[PDB]
Design a protein around this nucleic acid. Structure first.
Lengths: 94, 271, 46
RNA sequence: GCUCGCCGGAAGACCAAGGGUUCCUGUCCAACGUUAAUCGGGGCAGGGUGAGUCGACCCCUAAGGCGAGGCCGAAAGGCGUAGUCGAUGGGAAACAGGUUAAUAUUCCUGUACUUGGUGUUACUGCGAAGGGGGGACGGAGAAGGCUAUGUUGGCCGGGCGACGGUUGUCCCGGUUUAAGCGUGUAGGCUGGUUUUCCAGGCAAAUCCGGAAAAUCAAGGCUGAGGCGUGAUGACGAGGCACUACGGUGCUGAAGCAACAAAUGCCCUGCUUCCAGGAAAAGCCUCUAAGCAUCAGGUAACAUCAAAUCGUACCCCAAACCGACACGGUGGUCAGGUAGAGAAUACCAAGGCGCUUGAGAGAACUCGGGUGAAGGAACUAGGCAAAAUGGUGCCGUAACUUCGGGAGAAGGCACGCUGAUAUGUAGGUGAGGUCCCUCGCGGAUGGAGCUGAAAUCAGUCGAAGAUACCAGCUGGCUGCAACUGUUUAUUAAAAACACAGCACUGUGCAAACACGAAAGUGGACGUAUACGGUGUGACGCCUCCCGGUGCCGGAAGGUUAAUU
RNA sequence: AGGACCGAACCGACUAAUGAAAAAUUAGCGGAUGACUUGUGGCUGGGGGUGAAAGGCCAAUCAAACCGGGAGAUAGCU
């Protein structure tokens, strides 16, 4: 049982990319940005409540942040958690 | 028996094996085994404290019974076994109550022989009884110095001790060294000689054999530089000094016994 | 030619890492020294 | 894009470590790239790493570390018990195909497994910080059974030759398929089952151990591979539609047999040797306190569960360690022809041509080739080169520790074709036939397949171990017995070590060594042991105690603190 | 059987000629079942360690490591 507030705080954003689009169209899998602390079950619960849609499963991964250079100064981007959420057959998401 | 090996290679030429067929060809009695890791002759500080130790073969520790307390139960010898931990041979024995123990194999012992500890026990090889019960003039081995402690004298392959006298509460032993020593008459001892007497006839025959026995090579002090050893230095071969340890103490004769607590028990020093 | 530095992360940490420094007095003093200096990387710890 | 060339036990493929975006796409060429650069491991932007079963985490422990109390220590602190950490070792579970520009045992397709809960009905002794078993273990050797894999034939598809020939004993390609489940074989280990008792296993034990007694000779455990299923599937040479020339979608034959065969598996096996070969948990089992008709246990069935972190890329290197796009770096994979071979040569798969080129064709330098006549005259020195080089057979001295020396030396044969023998000796081994406690069985049988070595006859060359590969040999002699070790980076030796010898110490709280100490090593050893010193296989051997040491003695002289 | 033999890997480093290289190259060379070699982790600390002993090695540093401090040591010398 996950608290509603925590659920709301889990999901950061949808991830738009060619691979993501492909996953959406073919495998019925949405690619989300989520809280780095968010576990799989949590993510799933939040999907179910906040997008109102059945989940088969969640795969997660951690994206490491790129090192960049603004002018002369070096600086690193934040790491962030990606989640492939596979949605039950026939589940159409807005 | 001893066996001079044929010289099919140098390093095999001078080899003499000591082969006992009666030893157990098989894995030892595992319950009595336990782990025994190697030191390298280094203490808890991590420093080398005794030179020339190192390496050698992995060895298990057989749990030998030197205290020998199963009084009254007769035991029978199952087999003789190779112990890597000692110059003697060990004997796996079976008490009538079902317990097994390892003991020093005495001279005449073999499979099927019955042995017994206790005051009542019979005065025959392998039997163990207090030295007040043991007749004077007998050879014994695995001798306790303190009652109840466990045998400490005469454990090596072909040793034994002579009870020369029993004077009241003490008996006087003739140690293998030739030292005459008083010992409390209630201390325990095993009849007969310890077994593997032709152990001394073996000759290693090559450097590697010594290494197998965990012995690293020995460098002569005279071969060193002065900063290392008292004997070091000298252009060519020079040795113009009295022999000494690496720590400057005289070596060829100077006595080093300092124990004034046990002086009383030493009847006569060895010669 | 086998050069002196043959990196190994675990070995690095055990030898020089934060907890190692913490464990003993002298290490703690080293840490304090480095803090005083203003070091950004107090220890080898990544 | 077509040729050429190089690697191919790697200069290919996959990992660990280490690195940390170098990966992919677009874009730019100031700087970086030893030149140019449209290119890049460079700049900028965007994208990319998907796990119940892989790894970490986690349970267990080794060396070792920390260490409540504790012991010790001016202080700091040292050692260490109970404990707790510590892999490089032990511990549950997944395979095949398809897919991305870039991930995949992680996505998808199919087919599996695991171990937990929870709920069930069925039953009914469960229970540990404890007992027992197990886990659990060396080197070498030898085979036998296998597979990986390869070759040939068969089959299937395609072909009929840019130049003489090529419808055949011709040419090219393909002929693959997992875990799992069932079977329990080649083979290995062990005698089983029941009953009775017992000073043992810190207590108890129905368990282990030990005694007896009965009865049956088959009982159990283990075990590669094969076979069956998995699979009416997948994949499949290439054909056929579209084409952003990158590719996408449809389609799809055969898919067998024999032989050979590992260093891989059975094998943690067997045989043997001495130098005598981790631990703990998981796992099985036994009970104790307990509880007692509850819980707990096992039984299937249902459901839920498996979190977290890693997953890109390089990884014998241009990405790691070397200041560099400069030698070092552990593991796994191991095709063909020749060959003993993981050597060597040429090749496959795959990957590269080493990030300055173009000319010229002086000296001199480097690395190579050949050389009349001589053949060590060179030189400190045959340094370096040259030479030898294989298999089989013949043959082989002194001396010897009888093992050696010895590959001593020195010689002969060696290609191809035919015949012996349309392919032999051998190896393998199908049908058929017989037996049978019935199977992965046993006999007989020999088809087919493979296949040396030799002899005889012929034949070509200057040359047949034809290339690569591949000992120079002998004689006297010093030193060191020998195999070993050594000055990382001018010394590899006659130096060190060595087995052996001798002396000497040390009676165990050993001597000695590290430690203001506690303690630790010595050693879980005990004089057939340990320490120190010298000598240094083996053979024949091996006067002086005055000096300095050490050992013993203590009559006298001298002699501290103290008084 | 073997600190046995020939010989790749692997470990080394006797001869030779010659910065890509702060010790390498090529051609040869020794060992190659052992006193072998190697990965991972662990322990020994500076008058200390380790040393088959060369004063060798202890982070390209060794007849006393490196870092910081006494410290502006002292310098009848340049």
């Amino acid at each position: 049982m996950i608290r509603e507030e925590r659920l709301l705080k889990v999901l950061r954003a949808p991830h738009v990319s060619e691979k993501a689009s492909t996953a959406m169209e073919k495998s019925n899998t949405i690619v989300l940005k989520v809280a780095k602390d968010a576990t799989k079950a949590e993510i799933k619960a939040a999907v179910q409540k906040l997008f109102e849609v059945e989940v088969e499963v969640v795969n997660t991964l951690v994206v490491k942040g790129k090192v960049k250079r603004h002018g002369q100064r070096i600086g690193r981007r934040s790491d962030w958690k990606k989640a492939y959420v596979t949605l039950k057959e026939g589940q159409n998401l807005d | 028996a001893v066996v001079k090996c044929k010289p099919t290679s140098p390093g095999r030429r001078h080899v003499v094996k000591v082969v006992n067929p009666e030893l157990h060809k098989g894995k030892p009695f595992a319950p009595l085994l336990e782990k025994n890791s190697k030191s390298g002759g280094r203490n808890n500080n991590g420093r080398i404290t005794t030179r020339h130790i190192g390496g050698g073969h992995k060895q298990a520790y057989r749990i030998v019974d030197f205290k020998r307390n199963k009084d009254g139960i007769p035991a029978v010898v199952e087999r003789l076994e190779y112990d890597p931990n000692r110059s003697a041979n060990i004997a796996l024995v079976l008490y009538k109550d079902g317990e097994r123990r390892y003991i020093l194999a005495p001279k005449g012992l073999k499979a099927g022989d019955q042995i017994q500890s206790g005051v009542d026990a019979a005065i025959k090889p392998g039997n163990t009884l207090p030295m007040r019960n043991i007749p004077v003039g007998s050879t014994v081995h695995n001798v306790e110095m303190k009652p109840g402690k466990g045998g400490q004298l005469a454990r090596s392959a072909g040793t034994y001790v002579q009870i020369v006298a029993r004077d009241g509460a003490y008996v006087t032993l003739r140690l293998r060294s030739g030292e005459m020593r008083k010992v409390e008459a209630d201390c325990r001892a095993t009849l007969g000689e310890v077994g593997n007497a032709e152990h001394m006839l073996r000759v290693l025959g090559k450097a590697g054999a010594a290494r197998w026995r965990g012995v690293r090579p020995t460098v002569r002090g005279t071969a060193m530089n002065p900063v290392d050893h008292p004997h070091g230095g000298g252009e060519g071969r020079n040795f113009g000094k009295h022999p000494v340890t690496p720590w400057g103490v005289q070596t060829k004769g100077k006595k080093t016994r300092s124990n004034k607590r046990t002086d009383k028990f030493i009847v006569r020093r060895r010669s | 030619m086998k050069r002196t530095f043959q990196p190994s992360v675990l070995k690095r940490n055990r030898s020089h890492g934060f907890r190692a420094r913490m464990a003993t007095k002298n290490g703690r003093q080293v840490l304090a020294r480095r803090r005083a200096k203003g070091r950004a990387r107090l220890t080898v710890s990544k």
